[PDB]
Design a protein around this ligand. Structure first.
Ligand SMILES: C[C@H](O)[C@H]1O[C@@H](OP(=O)(O)OP(=O)(O)OC[C@H]2O[C@@H](n3cnc4c(O)nc(N)nc43)[C@H](O)[C@@H]2O)[C@@H](O)[C@@H]1O
Ligand SMILES: C[C@H](O)[C@H]1O[C@@H](OP(=O)(O)OP(=O)(O)OC[C@H]2O[C@@H](n3cnc4c(O)nc(N)nc43)[C@H](O)[C@@H]2O)[C@@H](O)[C@@H]1O
Ligand SMILES: C[C@H](O)[C@H]1O[C@@H](OP(=O)(O)OP(=O)(O)OC[C@H]2O[C@@H](n3cnc4c(O)nc(N)nc43)[C@H](O)[C@@H]2O)[C@@H](O)[C@@H]1O
Ligand SMILES: C[C@H](O)[C@H]1O[C@@H](OP(=O)(O)OP(=O)(O)OC[C@H]2O[C@@H](n3cnc4c(O)nc(N)nc43)[C@H](O)[C@@H]2O)[C@@H](O)[C@@H]1O
Ligand SMILES: [Mn+2]
Ligand SMILES: [Mn+2]
Ligand SMILES: [Mn+2]
Ligand SMILES: [Mn+2]
Lengths: 371, 371, 371, 371
């Protein structure tokens, strides 16, 4: 096979996460692209070079190197600073260097097994008749594959209007051709849930008991960027959306990967591809957060997500590859921004979709400049 | 004994709730003060007169009669229209007419037993040595007295910072002198939880299993206005706070009774009185709500509640009765508004406490004008 | 020549303005397209038919007729209600019916001479070597053509950063080929100034003493929609921009024709056309306004206009006709929204340009559907 | 006589203004209380010590010395940092040290005559029968005492609703008993006008031609804090109001001295005192400002000022001295905050008056703690 893999992690820490992330990466020969920011301490570069001597192929381009690359591609204002949106630099760098698998992670997700990179290489097996998982309501709850206490939880970015009626949905498995291009790995410890769920029950993922599934055409599930492998063909559709836009005077945040996880998923199924959920599982000792502040950031995005996901099912896309499909998706978001109705859809909330669509085309324009 | 009781309910519905609320009220001789609003149809007045023929002492003063009463008391702008804040008119009316017990309810809380009013008369038994419930953390979860599925929940208004450590709290019962003046009855069906909790687990209260408790000095718990009896002495401290103040440009709502429940509870303990939780239990088939809109309304108040409750334990109050104690409480809130620190304490968030304090004195000034 | 002219006026009044607007329109045979709204009284239709008997060709399509037309062109959500933006319906109707001249007016601008329509027909003379007016600073003050007391004033939409240094600018006249396609007529009484000027000196236009000018390439001046004739070729670029977008949490208003006046002007000079200022002059007994409310509406737009106009001089446009040039302008506004910097350029302020650009393409798409 | 005078100036500059401010201050023996801030460089302290060697009684207490003084008076959170509100420290310091005259100035107002302090000592002559200036509309335009080009202007803080009808007002002078306690000196160069006026005509004060006047009972005029002498008895009523309160989500600024100028003027007339306008005249080479940013800061306060000034004529005050009158004024503002009606009076706009009133009593509570 001879598959190449690059791990993308943006961080502002000192680099102590390398002591638990490097072993699983250097044993597989994968590259770790660390994306620092302006407010990143100089201890990260010393930690990257400390693990560079141990055999880990890790790079840490300074903010000057990142800006010189983005300026050559006519996108100097696309990716802002003091934000985790800079992981798009790692997405771009890994895509230019010809890596087969781009693994998006955070500085607090730690692989639990030695075959972490090997399990993420499932996005390179190509098409094959395989068992696919379908749901009668068109949604799949990936947290059902985990043992979560005290009660059952839904993942972050899961539509709320479909949660009460999801328990009585019919889940079936059929032998169908599928082409896995996105593999969202599960997480133990603190699972990826929204601030509403974490403030209510404080979930704790005990074990992985559900195995792995491949969702069929029409069944969706939110995909995050903390333990997700994306094939290089689907990478153009995996642009981490820019946050900070006010909805009803409240700037949204924490949903950059919620849109990207859904955008690359809608684009994949249009091109005959599928999304996988399950292994490899990582430990998630989540960074210390103000949970009420996470709620303050997530509310502006939650009030709009359910309407966005519903209109995406009514808008058939066009395109032959992920570049054409993603740009067709951006124009579809602009038509949705004017057809959708509701109390939360103020003029600035509709404008959020229009500016995001322009930033999506600015992202694809930079990739076409490289190729 | 010969105890009098008046039930206060404000509503914009057609009055169909009277069919299930009247039987327990007319059999006890209690008065039902229905407070309509400008957005209330003429079906409520026809429903009040229909049950008045059957023997229910129900009154429904028109908005013209309400405004004439408030204008004669030099408070024409205290209580706004198109808001459930108009229940303060019922609090005022029941207090002017000399009722011993004022029961605050909503148009969807329906009693389950014939002795609903009799159980609410516990706020007129006077002081007596009785078992009181104390907690090491100073908080009591009244929802623990209920059988809630699928998991344990906290009531609306419970501080979030004290929820994780509450499982390790020590609950003790001792024979201490206490005087019950507020009786917060429990609710079956849809329990009184915040939008964060209802959006995450959709709680369902199955039965009342914990009995009744009387909190000791230093143990607090939120008290709503949907099934709560208040002695006429503690009625001046039960002013339903006016909502609509913006916090970071977001107007707060749904927490008018959260502050009143805590304010009358802080004033009661300063005067040697206590709060009771438990019976009578009512059925709560809650009206249809947009839960994402309930969340958008409650988040501004949730960001500030934990800090307000913490600083209220630092301010010992003054006063001999509830009128003087509540006014002393308003001045203490204005000192807290400038001492408190935090990200959510913008200039408009601090100004919310100053304007609320003025409305609290404008309220007590109206009661003093009556007496 | 045999030139056709249609006057477009949107109003919510009773139609009393027809008693002073009809004589100058029926004597020239021009058509008056009145655009009512949902909040327009039924007295307007009775006034349109009252003047229809006197010979005035006046039409007043109901909101049902307007929505049926906009729905056939796949633009049902483009033009909102309860807004003067509905004048775009008259722009569209006059453009479909093949009128040579489209005159945009308001219900308070009254022609002072009998040859009002004849003077507005100057946008049909075609190219000819004529004296053109150029300025060293690239700006022209059309109010200098009027006698204004107590002091000199600038028109609404004039950039503030160029006002102090405009007095020492060199104004020259040269014999140059020009093709007049937009003719902005002057106004007596209350001149078209921003709320800042009207609150400061309360201008009063006494007489028209400067005559008429035709601005050369590179010299700009704001063009309003209250007394402006536009040739049918330039009509696609005269889309009245949609207002109501919050900038720093403040919705902008009163600048819909400021952008359209500048957009059709930038598009005209790219295609070798020019803008004329001067006759015909109209009386402007302005409707009663809250001047502090006008300031509250205009401030969000004023804070951004100077930066927008500067970047438009740095962005060369493309296109062979007004449809291609206007759409190229919309994409230029999206590039400006990301390159511009400043304190007033918040994420929602930049999003204002992105949503406006989409509405500009939705406007051109509806015109291409007709043709 | 033997009158003492202390000049209060807060600044973040390097101290170069002392070269033109010291000569008139050191020749009169007056004290200069310079109030630095956290964003003040070390060049100011070196400039204060440089002029202290030349005989200027100038003091510059560090932010640590200021905070220790405010903490000992139980007001550590009253005066914020990074704001010109810190001049209240100078007001407090000059009042504690027993100075008869407190002159409030800015770091860009420079005296033009040698008797600058001597002319400001008019607030210590006591009551005497003197010619007083009265107006039929109750307003006086102090800018009419100046020679302003290109047109007549109104001072910053003048109500806009009274500006048109002010030209028909009757100005009379009568010999009436008056007691001058506030002396608002005039300014040449850049006059103290609002951003609306400066953005429209760019006024330039050429000379002082109107002399000096003493307004009668019922005639008001805004009084700034850049060239104003205040007797030590009226100093408690001269609290510089704290800015930053949002009105419709827009924080107000630049009007801290507008309220203080009116508040000390309303309190003075209740106690039988008057306000004087005219000499001494200073040069005002105003610091560089973004006028569009000055407008964005002043609009929120302008929308409310006319209504506040109107209701202040409906509330007669109580109190024997300025401490009691200013506190009575704070309670009257809270009654106005609920009586006033208008589009601009959102819940946060009314709450601005309630929080400001609490800060006014927190101010006077600090003065009472000293005395
Ligand atoms: C932001 C959202 O919250 C997202 O967090 C995700 O997981 P999360 O909620 O668990 O947060 P967490 O894993 O702790 O950090 C997430 C990673 O962003 C990095 N980071 C933080 N501040 C940064 C800054 O200024 N610059 C740069 N360049 N990077 C920064 C940190 O180093 C972490 O590696 C999703 O939920 C959601 O899309
Ligand atoms: C609103 C908050 O949310 C409060 O609700 C409580 O319970 P709740 O969350 O279950 O809502 P609910 O019981 O349905 O209505 C509560 C009652 O207010 C009445 N009402 C509704 N709109 C009204 C209007 O315009 N005018 C007047 N005069 N009254 C109105 C309804 O008729 C109900 O009787 C607490 O949570 C919280 O303090
Ligand atoms: C709005 C800005 O203010 C614009 O006014 C212009 O002139 P202006 O400032 O002098 O205002 P004015 O001439 O009085 O009215 C302007 C005309 O809009 C009509 N109108 C008003 N409310 C309406 C509504 O809800 N629906 C519909 N369909 N039409 C409405 C009125 O009937 C007038 O005919 C420019 O300044 C600026 O672009
Ligand atoms: C601000 C308003 O606008 C006020 O200006 C007045 O006059 P003005 O409009 O002409 O401004 P200006 O005279 O330049 O500065 C006024 C003085 O505040 C000082 N200053 C500036 N930033 C400061 C900061 O962070 N901390 C501290 N401690 N001080 C600061 C400067 O050094 C000047 O001495 C009134 O209009 C209005 O009440
Ligand atoms: Mn994490
Ligand atoms: Mn309810
Ligand atoms: Mn007009
Ligand atoms: Mn100044």
């Amino acid at each position: 096979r001879d598959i190449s893999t690059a791990v993308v992690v943006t961080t502002i820490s000192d680099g102590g996460f390398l002591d638990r992330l490097a072993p699983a990466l250097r044993d597989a020969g994968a590259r770790l692209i660390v994306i620092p920011d302006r407010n990143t301490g100089p201890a990260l570069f010393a930690a990257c070079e400390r693990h560079r001597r141990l055999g880990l192929d890790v790079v840490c381009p300074s903010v000057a190197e990142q800006q010189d690359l983005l300026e050559r591609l006519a996108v100097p204002d696309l990716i802002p600073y003091h934000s985790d949106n800079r992981r798009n630099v790692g997405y771009l760098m890994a895509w230019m260097e010809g890596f087969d698998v781009i693994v998006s992670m955070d500085d607090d997700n730690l692989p639990t097994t030695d075959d972490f990179v090997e399990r993420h290489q499932v996005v390179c097996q190509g098409p094959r008749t395989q068992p696919v998982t379908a749901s009668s309501d068109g949604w799949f709850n990936n947290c059902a594959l985990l043992e979560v206490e005290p009660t059952e939880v839904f993942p972050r970015g899961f539509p709320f209007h479909a949660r009460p009626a999801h328990a009585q949905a019919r889940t079936s498995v059929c032998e169908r051709p599928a082409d896995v291009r996105i593999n969202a790995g599960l997480w133990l410890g603190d699972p990826d849930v929204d601030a509403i769920t974490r403030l209510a029950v404080r979930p704790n993922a005990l074990a992985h008991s559900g195995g792995s599934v491949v969702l069929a055409e029409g069944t969706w599930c939110p995909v995050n960027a903390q333990n997700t492998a994306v094939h290089r063909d689907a990478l153009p559709a995996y642009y981490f959306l820019r946050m900070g836009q006010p909805v009803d005077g409240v700037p949204m945040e924490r949903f950059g990967d919620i849109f990207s996880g859904y955008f690359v998923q809608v684009c994949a199924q249009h091109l005959g591809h599928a999304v996988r959920f399950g292994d490899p599982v990582v430990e998630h000792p989540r960074n210390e957060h103000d949970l009420l502040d996470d709620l303050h950031k997530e509310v502006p995005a939650v009030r709009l997500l359910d309407d966005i996901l519903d209109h995406l099912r009514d808008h058939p896309l066009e395109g032959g590859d992920y570049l054409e499909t993603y740009e067709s998706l951006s124009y579809a978001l602009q038509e949705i921004a004017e057809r959708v109705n509701g109390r939360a859809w103020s003029p600035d909330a509709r404008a959020f979709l229009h500016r995001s669509a322009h930033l999506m085309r600015s992202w694809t324009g930079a990739l076409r400049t490289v190729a």
